[PDB]
């Protein structure tokens, strides 16, 4: 279980500990470089847009275009020269940039907002509240956290207890299960898994899919972020056509700009993901 972010108020700053280390973070930071797309969406939802001085622009998804003219700090690829030239007072990162921590932390205090795949909602709430604490915005962040909790309960209430889903990432097809990077389908929304026994996932084929006969298949097509080959075609075969999922038109292509980029730290992006699952299975 990932160590949470903890903060103690030391006047004009916080002493902050997270799973990667300790930082002294000034209150109300005014020059923030954000490399996690989810928390960037949370900055927006808390009205902190003007605090942001740098974002991964090569990346930037359709739902974060209010940031497209921020100075770019990379996309996988971090530009440390650009980050240094901004002279930030805070850098914010998530799991994909933990490999860059020591170098980012030479430039400025670096806050990790990791999403624990075994404890998604507690990590999401801690990440959002910790950001908000920096700005004195706890009351606004609690309201919005509540709204997400209410959307989760609405989605959960309509789930068919007797139906099972398979999650896949796509020529390679790989299966994911509970407590994976896509785990919230099973772990938060309570949609049963075809295999509860499954960060790279398990290699599979159309035969595996037919074998399992899922009522739903949730597809995350990583081609879209990169190709001419797409999931609709990898799955366009007579084996996959045999499934309950194909028969009832419940092969559900999820937007990878949410699911693969992993924008679960976002107050509004997480909502959109919940609604996306709910509207597929109701």
Author numbering: 22 to 96, 98 to 192, 195 to 222, 226 to 253, 255 to 310
Authors' account:
The periplasmic binding protein (PBP) CeuE1 is an important component of the Fe(III) uptake system in Campylobacter jejuni, a commensal Gram-negative bacterium in the avian gut, but a common source of food poisoning in humans. CeuE, an integral part of the CeuBCDE ABC transporter of C. jejuni, is responsible for capturing Fe(III)-siderophore complexes in the periplasm for delivery to their respective inner membrane transporter. C. jejuni does not itself synthesize siderophores, but capitalizes on their secretion by other bacteria, such as E. coli. Here we report a combined solution and structural study of a series of synthetic tetradentate analogues of the enterobactin-derived bis(2, 3-dihydroxybenzoyl-L-Ser), to explore the ligand-binding promiscuity of CeuE, both wild type and with mutations of the Fe(III) binding residues H227 and Y288.
In addition, the double mutants H227L/Y288F and H227A/Y288F were created. All five mutants (Y288F, H227L, H227A, H227L/Y288F, H227A/Y288F) were crystallized in their apo form, and all structures are closely similar to that of wild type CeuE. However while there is clear electron density for the Y288F mutation in its three structures, H227L and H227A are located in a flexible loop region and there is generally no electron density to confirm their presence. Mutation of the Fe(III)-coordinating tyrosine led to a drastic drop in binding affinity in both the single (Y228F) and the double mutants (H227L/Y288F and H227A/Y288F), with Kd values above 1 μM. Site-directed mutagenesis of CeuE revealed that Y288 is essential for binding, as the binding affinity observed in the fluorescence titration experiments is far weaker for all mutants containing Y228F when compared to the wild type protein. This finding is confirmed by the lack of CD signal corresponding to the Λ-configuration when Fe-5-Lic is added to these mutants.
